[PDB]
Design a protein around this nucleic acid. Structure first.
Ligand SMILES: O=C(N[C@H](Cc1ccccc1)C(=O)Nc1ccccc1N1CCS(=O)(=O)CC1)c1ccccc1F
Ligand SMILES: [Mg+2]
Ligand SMILES: [Zn+2]
Lengths: 98, 147, 49, 91, 1095, 97, 49
DNA sequence: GAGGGTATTCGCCGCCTACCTCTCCTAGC
DNA sequence: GCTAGTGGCGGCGAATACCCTC
RNA sequence: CGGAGAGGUA
């Protein structure tokens, strides 16, 4: 209805969620039980913290590092595949398990 | 029949199918709502949600491996049962069977424990908050003051 | 269902609300407190504000 | 109950505990005396039907209203026969 | 007339007591020391047990090793065993361990023997079992540099317990029994409302007792011969609807292990392994002894077994049926007669004490069981003729168990070190809650009550005030614990109504069979009782008058029931229970002061309390002091040897206080063994001194002492009467970091050279430098990428003082630093705190309050000679709270300070007939003692008040009523009526207002939900809970509540906009959606719920 | 000194059993670290002076200040909302005098 | 809760004996525990109301 | 066999608010 | 240093397990 | 500042 949240709320509706809804919310699938690497302290790919699913961990930076400036705004990297945006996005994006 | 009709009418009046009770996919909460911190020295203290998601993923992956590779009915059924139990523990830990406990023999927190109780989401964060521009100290008596 | 879930028995209330597909009209003190809106009482009433 | 538990049970609309039966039709009563039970029969003035309470334990006393309740005594529609707390649901 | 004559150099404190003490107070740290030296099997314990129970002397470790060994595999062709545990010297001394953050421990070795049954070869080795933490001489452990105290636990003893209940729905008396083992499986019997006896193994369905009886092999003839006299048994044999030993075994197997083949052999094996395994079921020695005593099975045989038996079960069932059939005696075949009755579960004869040694033994036992599993597994997958004891034993689980116990246990607790009394009472503490005890919330009102069996074993006064009320108690003065773990207490035997001097220790169950008189029973210079009838105590809290020839025992003192802290309250019997409890609790919160002074009026339980606590220095051997200094004392013993004692100066306690020791001997004085040679934190000449003597007035004054507030003079600040020293500890470390090599140096970028004035060349402040909030303590830079940032150590908000010491550990000097750190500099800053408004004072009688005001000396009420009063207490708090012992203490304190002389020109006055000689005269500032229950009377107090010495000029300022005529310091007019003045003992509590003031405008926020952090140390915000929201909604204040909930807590953009608006002249903007609602929506979606916001 | 002039401040003591557990006052700077409370509001707060502590909150916006100054001012709440009896009246030492 | 047939004839001005103090302490601690339980029980009722 | 009652029995829910100090955080190759 | 995994108690309602005729 | 435990204040 009101996307994230915007004033002029009218109602708050609840219901059962289908598999289609779950896959629509998802930005990607999680298929490795890896959280974080200890040698580099960076998220593991396809893990519970993968940056290609949940978004960058730094403002306007990619996992590979090809783009690290505000100019490369809104473009998905062609090497790492992480969309270049702000780091607060990790509080909003959800994955899913097939 | 009164109770059966209560539930059946609940599912009939609305435009909602009853097929939502069986799950073909599991959502994963955003990482910033289940952060993992590091203790003095550089050793991580993993959250409880991460452990449950990890167990679910392990069991699902090994079940998929067994299914693809081909195996007798018994092993596939056992893996399916263990996956069922893992997802049940993730959603509501301790409801059925022994709780999935971590180190120290203490039950892990589930997605259903973030909302319930005196320390749950509602009563601890939405009905009450911590605020700025606030202080505290001991009170003494001032007779000279006015009302 | 928000006021009921914030009072007691969160799991049962939530499952019943999900099954019945209940819609919550945010007309109440506790609900407006939860969503951060002016309560419909005192100085938050239309004739006063 | 006689304090905070009494207040809680009043506000929770529970059965009092020491429930005291209350009449439901005006008429005379044929009180019976026995061990571990009393038979209180309501004989209405109209006489359409007779109600009876036989499970009343002898531990509870008989309320005094207007003299103690006795056989062949007329009672009100909402009179409390025994001594105790009547449940809010019957009234 | 004096108090003590045993301690050599004790002050002469004269007592009002009229009773002689047959017995001296025991060592007050004996429980912990004895329990631990039993565990390690020290020679001292060996001798102590030999002079009594020499039949079976074995320590805890030896017992565990005997229990565990031998370890044999299934085939039985090989075995392993352990014996003779041994200890080496401690690796490092106690002070070294405390300084270097080590653990005080000693290596432990055991002898392992490996025997092969088919070859006859024996291979023996000495295997190292890991370092074993060792208790110090003061009853504490040093674990990772922190002193800890292991607390004794009150637990329900193993045994068999019978109880009775009256059912609600029907009128019946239903009986039950429970056989509670030590690490075993429960077993229950009961008779239900259908007059049928049954069984309930663990938490399964009920079964008739006949089923089990036949499963044991009995038949109808056997069961009927013995049982059957009870109608219930003969009725249960009819409706069982089953018969046959194999059938009963199969039924039991079905009930125990559903879904498995019900075979007779499997059922028998499972049952015999459940209740007769000797490894899965155990009663211990206490359990076996208690079961034998209750059922009267074995009276001569020793306690050599620890498992159940058929005779025990049949005796239990017979006992149950006889109890249910209203009988009062029985005689099981081959046993002595015993009465049948129910058991009170809270009786002190039924619940025992697990001391430190027993808890450590349990942990060692579980660790060794894990090691045994490992060794048994490893014994079947290894080649023969190549296995040696060292190749089979894995020590990791044992050391892990010891680490876990001493680090993360509920009974191993951070020691309390406000003052010596706090620690002494912490070591003598009994707690009912722990791993195997009660719950702080679920516990009911009947487990928290005072029981008649507590008399002389647990103090009824000293307990917490919060949710732990009644769950934590303190051991009594004369009590001790016997080998089985039951608390004892001494009694003085009397024969034919003549009190003898022969002390015997009795447990509660033993004591319940006799009647014991009070210590305050008149005597006629010998044991004979003066009066013909005596008031005595009986079984269940009952007192009766009995002829003097029927008395069995007698208390050793009228203070047998109180504890150490409660025995230091003068005029205790004049105070109500609540205020006495408060005073006993609050004596343990006093802070050490710069200078100490002992009370004018005490009780005598202060010299021994100070000596036994251990914070004073005592001369071990006689000699002559050779050299005395502020740092050490040297004693020249008679035999030519010397010993030097080092004084710990300006040390820091676990609670930030100061622990400074001062010598009290001269350079030529001669000392005696056991004499106090130096003072401690709260000690004055070897006596506890927790406060100061102050001249008090008991009037209300202008509303400044309104509602428990206090008024103080300014002399107490000018003369540093109530000043204290507090010490803080700050530390920082330099790690390797993934970025690399963060360093401590004085080169910090973008900092003025003035800000770096106090730092030395290394980069740390200089000793003796004054530090204020925000000041640099250790300059450090970390390479966040030059990019080196500043991550130096600062002084927290509201903290200041003088730097008095620095300790730096550098890896370059081969220091035992943790992994990944190079430097671990520590900084100590101390500050003297004077008394100020908001600080908490208190007397010994439960009177407390914060300092409302501090007045100039020029405007305090003063006596006719011009003496201001130091403190003013309000009149309206005394009579309502039923603590009138403070007024009596005030009167006696004035009498002691002023001095007196009874004018016995023509015989002593009748009120001084029983007053001890040496108490008919005193000099100014005389120290006296009034024991807790045998002290000064009211008539004696009146007499002393009526005869006191004049002041310097020769005038008596306080009349016979204890009241003086004061002047008004502000107007100079005399007050219309006389006021009550005197001296009482005031203590300064560790509740200073400097540690409680906190304010905030903005700071850290939590990450999951963007709300302010909570905590003074975190610079957190004050919580606005649900009830405050209810109050705001009741006021009708909508905008205030909205702003509090949105822009002050978690409106991420609203916060910054509000700050900008305020720092400019603009007005506050409107709020927005808080972040917690979004977090809730995300969690609900994660629960697979389709939540949407419609518009 | 001039910034805090006529800026109301809310004081609260837990537990907040009824409405008068929160009230607004006019701050005035004092020397020390303890808060000085009027003797006539102790009954409303249920506060004695044996060690109690209180929390302070600052209203920011114009509406919040108006509410704190009109609705919640201590001198405007003299009577008990439950029964109407006065709560800010003399007690103890004042009654004796 | 029932009264004992034996009274405490001493007052706190005179000082209770050791057997008249034991029972007094029993009663006092019982009252304190009851007060704690009552304060825990009243808040739940207030929240429900 | 088949309707009419059971008739306990077992599982789940609930159990005041606010603050302060201190210690520990997985085992195995 | 890296990888893997037999001390709470009341209230309420649904559910088995149990007859009771019938 | 994430969690667990222990102790204390009103
Ligand atoms: O009763 C007295 N003192 C007894 C003294 C006593 C203490 C410990 C052991 C044995 C005796 C008492 O404290 N009992 C006791 C202690 C704790 C809990 C219950 C009990 N009781 C009460 C008297 S009870 O009903 O018979 C049976 C249970 C007493 C003496 C003098 C004057 C008046 C008195 F009420
Ligand atoms: Mg108070
Ligand atoms: Zn890239």
């Amino acid at each position: 209805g009101a996307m994230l949240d915007v004033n002029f709320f009218d109602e708050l509706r609840i219901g059962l969620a289908t598999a289609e809804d779950i896959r629509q919310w998802s930005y990607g699938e999680v298929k490795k039980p890896e959280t974080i690497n200890y040698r580099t302290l960076k998220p593991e790919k396809d893990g519970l913290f993968c940056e290609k699913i949940f978004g960058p961990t730094r403002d306007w930076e990619c996992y590979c590092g090809k783009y690290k400036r505000v100019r490369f705004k809104g473009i998905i990297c062609e090497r790492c595949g992480v969309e270049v945006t702000r780091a607060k996005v990790r509080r909003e994006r959800m994955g899913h398990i097939e | 029949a009164l109770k059966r009709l209560k539930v059946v009418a609940a599912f009939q009046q609305s435009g909602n199918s009853p097929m939502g009770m069986v799950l073909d996919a599991v959502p994963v909460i955003p990482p910033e709502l289940r952060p993992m911190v590091q203790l003095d020295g550089g050793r991580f203290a993993t959250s409880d949600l991460n452990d449950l998601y990890r167990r679910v993923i392990n069991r699902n992956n090994r079940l998929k491996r067994l299914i693809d590779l081909g195996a007798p009915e018994i092993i596939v059924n056992n893996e399916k049962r263990m996956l069922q139990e893992s997802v049940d523990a993730l959603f509501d830990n301790g409801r059925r069977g022994r709780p999935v406990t971590g180190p120290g023999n203490r039950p892990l927190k589930s997605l259903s424990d973030l909302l319930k109780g005196k320390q749950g989401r509602f009563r601890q964060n939405l009905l009450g908050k911590r605020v700025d521009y606030s202080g505290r100290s001991v009170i003494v008596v001032g007779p000279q003051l006015k009302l | 269902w928000l006021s009921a879930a914030s009072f007691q028995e969160t799991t049962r209330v939530l499952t019943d609300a999900a099954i019945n597909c209940r819609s919550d009209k945010l007309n109440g003190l506790k609900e407006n407190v939860i969503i951060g809106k002016l309560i419909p009482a005192g100085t938050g009433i239309n004739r006063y504000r | 109950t006689g304090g905070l538990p009494r207040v809680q049970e009043l506000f929770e609309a529970r059965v009092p505990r020491g429930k005291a039966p209350i009449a439901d039709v005006t008429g005379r009563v044929r009180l019976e005396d026995g061990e571990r039970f009393y038979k209180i029969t309501i004989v209405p003035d109209d006489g359409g039907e007779e109600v009876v309470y036989d499970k009343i334990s002898k531990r509870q006393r008989l309320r005094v209203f207007k003299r103690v309740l006795s056989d062949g005594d007329h009672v009100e529609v909402g009179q409390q026969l025994m001594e105790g707390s009547a449940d809010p649901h019957e009234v | 007339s004096s108090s003590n004559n045993s301690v050599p150099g004790a002050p002469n404190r004269v007592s009002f007591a009229k009773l002689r003490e047959p017995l001296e107070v025991p060592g007050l740290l004996d429980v912990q020391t004895d329990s631990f030296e039993w565990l390690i099997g020290s020679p001292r314990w060996r001798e102590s047990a030999a002079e009594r129970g020499d039949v079976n002397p074995v320590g805890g470790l030896e017992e565990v090793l005997y229990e565990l060994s031998p370890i044999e595999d299934f085939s039985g062709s090989m075995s392993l065993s352990f014996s003779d545990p041994r200890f080496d010297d401690v690796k490092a001394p106690v002070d070294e361990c405390k300084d270097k953050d080590m653990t005080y421990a000693a290596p432990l070795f055991v002898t392992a023997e490996f025997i092969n049954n088919n070859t006859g070869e024996i291979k023996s080795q000495t295997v190292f079992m890991g370092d074993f933490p060792m208790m110090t001489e003061k009853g504490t452990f040093i674990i990772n540099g922190t002193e800890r105290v292991v607390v004794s636990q009150l637990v329900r003893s193993p045994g068999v317990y019978f109880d009775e209940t009256i059912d609600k729905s029907t009128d019946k008396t239903l009986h039950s029994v429970k056989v509670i083992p030590s690490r075993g499986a429960w077993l229950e019997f009961d008779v239900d409302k259908r007059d049928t006896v049954g069984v309930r193994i663990d938490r399964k369905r009920r079964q008739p007792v006949t089923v089990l009886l036949k499963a044991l092999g009995w038949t109808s003839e056997q069961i009927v011969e013995r049982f059957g006299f009870s109608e219930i048994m003969r009725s249960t044999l009819e409706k069982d609807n089953t018969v046959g030993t194999d059938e009963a075994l199969l039924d039991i197997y079905r009930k125990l292990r559903p879904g498995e083949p019900p075979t007779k052999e499997s059922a028998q094996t499972l049952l015999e392994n459940l209740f007769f395994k000797e490894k899965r079921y155990d009663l211990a020695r206490v359990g076996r002894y208690k079961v034998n005593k209750k059922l009267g099975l074995h009276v001569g045989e020793p306690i050599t077994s620890s498992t159940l038996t058929e005779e025990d079960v049949v005796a239990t069932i017979e006992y149950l049926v006889r109890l249910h059939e209203g009988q009062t005696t029985m005689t099981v075949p081959g046993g002595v007669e015993v009465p049948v009755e129910t058991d009170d579960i809270d009786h002190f004869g039924n619940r025992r004490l697990r001391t430190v040694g027993e808890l450590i033994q349990n942990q060692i036992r579980v660790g060794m069981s894990r090691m045994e599993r490992v060794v048994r597994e490893r014994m079947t997958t290894q080649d023969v003729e190549a296995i040696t004891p060292q190749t089979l034993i894995n020590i990791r689980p044992v050391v892990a168990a010891i680490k876990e116990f001493f680090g993360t246990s509920q009974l191993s607790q951070f020691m309390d070190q406000n003052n010596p009394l706090s620690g002494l009472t912490h070591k003598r503490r009994l707690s009912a809650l722990g791993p195997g005890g009660l719950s702080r919330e679920r516990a009911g009102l009947e487990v928290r009550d005072v029981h008649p069996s507590h008399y002389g074993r647990m103090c009824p006064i000293e307990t917490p005030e919060g949710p732990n009320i009644g769950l934590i108690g303190s051991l009594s003065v004369y009590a001790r614990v016997n080998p089985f773990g039951f608390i004892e207490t001494p009694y003085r035997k009397v024969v034919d109504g003549v009190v003898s001097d022969e002390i015997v220790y009795l447990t509660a169950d033993e004591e319940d069979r006799h009647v014991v008189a009070q210590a305050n029973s008149p005597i006629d210079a010998d044991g004979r009782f003066v009066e013909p009838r005596v008031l005595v105590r009986r079984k269940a809290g009952e007192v009766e008058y009995v002829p003097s020839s029927e008395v069995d025992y007698m208390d050793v003192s009228p203070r047998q029931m109180v504890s150490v802290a409660t025995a230091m309250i003068p005029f205790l019997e004049h105070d109500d229970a609540n205020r006495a409890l408060m005073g006993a609790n609050m004596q343990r919160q006093a802070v050490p002061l710069v200078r100490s002074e002992a009370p004018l009026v005490g009780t005598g339980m202060e010299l021994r309390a100070a000596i036994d606590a251990g914070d004073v220095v005592v001369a071990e051997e006689s000699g002559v002091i050779e050299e005395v200094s502020a740092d050490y004392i040297t004693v020249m013993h008679d035999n030519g040897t010397r010993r030097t004692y080092r004084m710990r100066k300006f040390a820091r306690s676990n609670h930030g206080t100061c622990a400074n020791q001062c010598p009290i001997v001269d350079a030529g004085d001669r000392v005696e063994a056991g004499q106090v040679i130096a003072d401690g934190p709260c000690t004055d000449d070897g006596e506890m001194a927790l406060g100061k003597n102050l001249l008090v007035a008991i009037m209300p004054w202008e509303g400044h002492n309104y509602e428990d507030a206090i008024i103080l003079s300014n002399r107490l600040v000018e003369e540093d009467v109530l000043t204290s020293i507090h010490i803080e500890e700050h530390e920082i470390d330099a790690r390797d970091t993934k970025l690399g090599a963060e360093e401590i140096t004085r080169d910090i970028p973008n900092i003025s050279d003035e800000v770096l004035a106090d730092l030395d060349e290394r980069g740390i402040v200089r000793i003796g430098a004054e530090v204020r909030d925000g000041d640099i303590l250790v300059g450090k830079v970390t390479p966040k990428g030059r990019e080196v940032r500043d991550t130096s150590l600062k002084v927290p908000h509201g903290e200041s003082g003088k730097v008095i010491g620095i300790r730096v550990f550098s890896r370059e000097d081969e220091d035992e630093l943790p992994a990944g750190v190079n430097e671990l500099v520590r900084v100590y800053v101390a500050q003297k705190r004077k008394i100020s408004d908001g600080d908490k004072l208190a007397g010994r009688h439960g009177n407390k309050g914060v300092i409302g005001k501090i007045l100039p000396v020029e405007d305090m009420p003063f006596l006719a000679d011009g003496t201001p009063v130091d403190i003013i207490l309000n009149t309206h708090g005394v009579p309502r709270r039923m603590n009138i012992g403070q007024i009596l203490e005030t009167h006696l304190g004035w009498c002691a300070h002023s001095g007196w002389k009874v004018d016995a020109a023509k015989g002593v006055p009748d009120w001084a007939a029983r007053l001890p000689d040496e108490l008919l005269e005193a000099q100014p500032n005389a120290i006296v003692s009034t024991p807790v229950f045998d002290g000064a009377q009211e008539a004696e107090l009146q007499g002393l008040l009526s005869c006191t010495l004049p002041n310097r000029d020769g005038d008596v300022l306080v009349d016979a009523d204890g009241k003086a005529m004061l002047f008004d310091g502000r107007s100079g007019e005399p007050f219309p009526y006389p006021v009550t003045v005197g001296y009482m003992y005031i203590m300064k509590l560790h509740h200073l207002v400097d540690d409680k003031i906190h304010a905030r405008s903005t700071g850290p926020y939590s990450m999951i939900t963007q709300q302010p952090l909570g905590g003074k140390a975190q610079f957190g915000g004050q919580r606005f809970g649900e009830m405050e929201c209810w109050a705001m909604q009741a006021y009708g204040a909508a905008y205030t509540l909205q702003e509090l909930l949105t822009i002050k807590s978690d409106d991420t953009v609203g916060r910054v906009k509000v700050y900008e608006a305020i720092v400019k002249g603009e007005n506050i903007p409107e709020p927005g959606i808080p972040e917690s609602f979004k977090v809730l929506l995300k969690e609900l979606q994660s629960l697979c719920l389709n939540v949407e916001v419609l518009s | 000194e001039e910034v805090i002039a006529e800026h109301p401040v809310l004081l609260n003591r837990a537990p907040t059993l009824h409405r008068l557990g929160i009230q607004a006052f006019e701050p005035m700077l004092v020397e020390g670290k303890a808060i000085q409370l009027h003797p006539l509001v102790c009954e409303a707060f249920n506060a004695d002076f044996d060690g109690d502590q209180m929390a302070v909150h600052l209203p920011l916006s114009a509406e919040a200040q108006a509410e704190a100054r009109i609705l919640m001012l201590s001198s405007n709440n003299i009577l008990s909302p439950a029964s109407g009896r006065p709560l800010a009246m003399p007690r103890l030492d004042m009654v004796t005098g | 809760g029932e009264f004992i047939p034996r009274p405490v004839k001493s007052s706190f001005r005179e000082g209770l004996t050791v057997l008249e103090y034991f029972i007094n302490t029993h009663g006092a601690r019982k009252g304190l525990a009851d007060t704690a339980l009552r304060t825990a029980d009243s808040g739940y009722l207030t929240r429900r109301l």
